């Protein structure tokens, strides 16, 4: 647990760290935890995924939602069993002149399947004339980046999310 | 993949990149405006030119989607607001020449000077010192010297430049299928293809001309009153059947009549409502003001301030070396960052400018969810109207005596409210004829109905016929009087100041009617009522995504601008004026002139 809850750096949304883990009371009396509304409960082994997203997107990590995160980046099934927690990291994950080392994807050809991870980096093709691996007209590069800065309103700041799964 | 999915996909990437670059540029401009140096100028111009280049490239790129196939509305609105060729449709030489004459006109207006006729080494600029004589002096000869000399020594340098600014602008606008520059300007109030809320670029003229015909019965009476009062401070210079000489009107152009209040005050023995002493006697600092403003705004149902607004804002004047720009504004830096820049004192005018600017900020906060290109008022006149109704409502005794600045006793008489209404009319009504007439002149000049050897003739004919103001010295065709105004020589549209004055009172009446008000309209305060807040938010949260003729109906109940709320506002003053001009001659004749004898 100690590793992915307080580490020095977190992972980006299109490629999230995954841990198949081989004490719950301590996580509570801690950092503000701006949301702790889980579902499965009021096991053999557990997985613990984590990533960094925007503020006003945290309401999309949930069963049966829609957005550029729950369609191309991270989707939960309708019978979700683990839970989710999310909190603020505005002071540890932002810097003047932008923190361009966090990425997310906003173009894809088919919506994600539950519990899937997409690392591919092919040039997206919107038009009908094929692109053949070079940007330009109707062919884009699908990985943009948050420009995290400290002088953002709550909702555009970086938030760290950690999902625990059950089985 | 038809034609529309491609436009949508392209708009996504545009939104992302534009949001980022815009935040950077606006942060640079803020950091320069609050702390002036020599490196911040460069740190601002760098981002400014980068943003302009990005926008130009994206506009050139967005021309490949034929507008006549997009079937949605918001997609079409964005693509159309992005495809605007603007300037640069001209050749290179013409674009460079237009930029050069624009710069030369702005420089001439800014740094021109006129000096005394008996000591020519004692000149004085326009801003600190010329329009201080016009607004304070009570000498006929001094005001006449100032008025004549400004127009004769600066207006005569702007004519040969204006004569070709007109040609170049007309040609640029004709190269965009617009038929003249005036049509390009009116092309902001246009709605096309909504089946019930249409509006042509040619109906704005008709609607302005038809709603101005119902203001004349009040403007004529205010005119007669101001004239019969000026005839006691400059005896034997005004004629009781003629116009008003153009140099006796309070400022260099006569745009506002608000400096004549010390001369034409109805009841001069009753002091006006002015809370500056009771604010100092309670140690009201530069931060209790904004707290009370936020309290007023959250009372009706609107949100709080973002808590990033309190820390980053520059509310007071800074320390020893932090030279800034002390002009109150509201900044919308983007990405959820809203700020206020003003150097507040402990007075009463700042207590109202606080509410004005926070109204601007509330409008900016309401529609921050729309796409990038659709973040603005519904047209040119909505933002300032929304900002102004708050200052209108927060300056009434029924609100001051509940904040805590006035004694709970001290009921007000009727003479005090006539004083208040007359001071309001001297700056609200006394500026509608001027605005309408100047914009009519510019439209007729651009259209081609006034040949370039009849500009001053028509200008002074219309001034005598519409505004009721005669010139004190004949002006031949070598002058250019309109270009001696900021908006004319700096290429700014001017019709917004006329539609704003109507939207503002329509909003105020529709909001006071939902708060269940009973008295006259000039006593209403929308505070402490939730229905008014909801009715205002249901239009604030729209932005430019809907045609303005629908946003106006969401609040008021009509589709076009009306004028009945304004006269309903001024009714008591109207009755008093109609009973104070029994002996005078209501109206004016266009033949008398101060030199005809
Ligand atoms: C989260 O991790 C941090 C370090 O990554 C822990 O910080 C340490 O806390 C202990 C006890 O408070 C101190 O003795 C150490 O000096 C701290 N380390 C540093 C570098 O300051 C923290 O305890 C962890 N908290 C939880 C709940 O896991
Ligand atoms: C206002 O601007 C001035 C100059 O543009 C800033 O002064 C310098 O700021 C840099 C920024 O890191 C410092 O390293 C220098 O030591 C400052 N020098 C002096 C003489 O002040 C100033 O910091 C700016 N204001 C604020 C609040 O940062
Ligand atoms: C194209 O038009 C449709 C309707 O004409 C828009 O559909 C709306 O989309 C928003 C955004 O998801 C929804 O909240 C609304 O509920 C939709 N309306 C309806 C009636 O379903 C669509 O947004 C338009 N295209 C774009 C890019 O905005
Ligand atoms: C906007 O300006 C351009 C020129 O800068 C006009 O001309 C077209 O530009 C496109 C650019 O790719 C060319 O492909 C066309 O051949 C040009 N000529 C046309 C379309 O007749 C363009 O027409 C202007 N459009 C608007 C709406 O003003
Ligand atoms: C303000 O109110 C006073 C209070 O009545 C008005 O005074 C009246 O004026 C009329 C004029 O026709 C007289 O007939 C009444 O006798 C007056 N009242 C009293 C009690 O003597 C005054 O006219 C009002 N002023 C304005 C500008 O409306
Ligand atoms: C808005 O209404 C509230 C409550 O109805 C007013 O607040 C109270 O007003 C009563 C009546 O004077 C006072 O006795 C209380 O002390 C007030 N409470 C507070 C916390 O101030 C409030 O004054 C009204 N606001 C306006 C602008 O009229
Ligand atoms: C506004 O702020 C005050 C305290 O500053 C708080 O009590 C109030 O609940 C806030 N209003 C809203 C709508 O959150």
Numbering used by the authors:
A (entry chain E): 338 to 359, 364 to 383, 392 to 516
B (entry chain A): 19 to 615
Copy the relevant paper text:
Here we report the cryo-EM structures of the trimeric S proteins from the BA.1, BA.2, BA.3, and BA.4/BA.5 subvariants, with BA.4 and BA.5 sharing the same S protein mutations, each in complex with the surface receptor ACE2. The five sublineages of Omicron exhibit numerous mutations in the S protein, which is responsible for receptor recognition and facilitates fusion with host cells. The RBD may exhibit “up” and “down” conformations in reference to the viral surface, and only the “up” RBD can expose the binding site which is responsible for mediating the interaction with the peptidase domain (PD) of ACE2.
Additionally, BA.3 has combined mutations from BA.1 and BA.2. Compared with the WT S protein, the mutations S477N, Q493R, and Q498R in the Omicron RBD introduce new polar interactions with Ser19, Glu35, and Asp38 in ACE2, respectively. These additional contacts, particularly the strong salt bridges mediated by Arg493 and Arg498, may not only compensate for the lost interactions of Lys417, Asn501, and Tyr505 in the WT S protein, respectively, with Asp30, Tyr41, and Arg393 in ACE2, but result in a two-to-fourfold net increase in affinity. As seven of the eight common mutations shared by BA.1/3 are located on flexible NTD domain, only the G446S located on the RBD was mapped. In addition, G446S, a common mutation in BA.1 and BA.3, might lead to the interaction between Ser446 and Arg60 of the heavy chain in LY-CoV1404.
